[model samples]
Target: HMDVEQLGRSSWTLLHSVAASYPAQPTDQQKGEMKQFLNIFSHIYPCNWCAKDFEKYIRENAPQVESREELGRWMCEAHNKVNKKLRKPKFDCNFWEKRWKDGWD
Candidate 1:
């Protein structure tokens, strides 16, 4: 069985990496698919409570998929929601590209 923290790390890794490659100017259909991807992702998470939590989070906040930066910040904010609940440090969205896209020298 995957530990919650372990599962969460992998999930964030997947989400952030996807955001990194997300288009700067996506088509309407592309945005629709991205939204659908999140909905599908929310349902499949192993932890029931966390899955419900994520579903609710998405419902309330919605995903910002208008552009690469929007998606990145939205993903960061989504991660920070979990972080806040777990009393972890919140990430700085200003460094989102560096953190998720380009490696800092």
Candidate 2:
């Protein structure tokens, strides 16, 4: 089992390290998302297939979300959707959904 907080911290630490190391500029949102994704992705551990499912989850649900709250609702639904079909259980859509819920908040 992976500690979600450690995963998040590791992700952020990796991103910040990259940010500091990368001399080239990143946009505000890009930088923000980099930091955000680190935390976001940490909780949502994707076992190859689940990663695809997660991407699909984003593409399908992102459009329907009118607000950040709505996005979370959609993500939670997607998480359930992904978990139902997943082969292995580590972290799946619910993890990502939660991560997003926390990230935007």
Pick the TM-score winner.
1
Q: Write the per-residue lDDT of candidate 1 for residues 1-105, one digit (tens) a residue.
A: 759988888888999999999999999999999999999899998989999999999999999999999999999999999999999998888998997899562
- Model 2 lDDT vs. the true structure? 0.45
Residue 69 in candidate 2, Cα distance off native in Å: 2.5
With candidate 2 superimposed using the best TM-score fit, by how many Å does residue 94's alpha carbon deviate from the native? 15
> Candidate 1, which ten residues in sequence have the lowest lDDT sum?
96-105
Give lDDT: candidate 2, residue 26: 47
- Residue 30 shift from truth in candidate 2, angstroms: 11
Cα-based lDDT for every prediction: 0.92, 0.45
Off by over 4 Å in 2: 1-46, 63-65, 86-105
Residue pairs that clash (backbone atoms under 3 angstroms), model 1: none
TM-score for candidate 2 = 0.36
- Candidate 1 wrong stretches, greater than 4 Å: none
lDDT of 2 at 19: 34
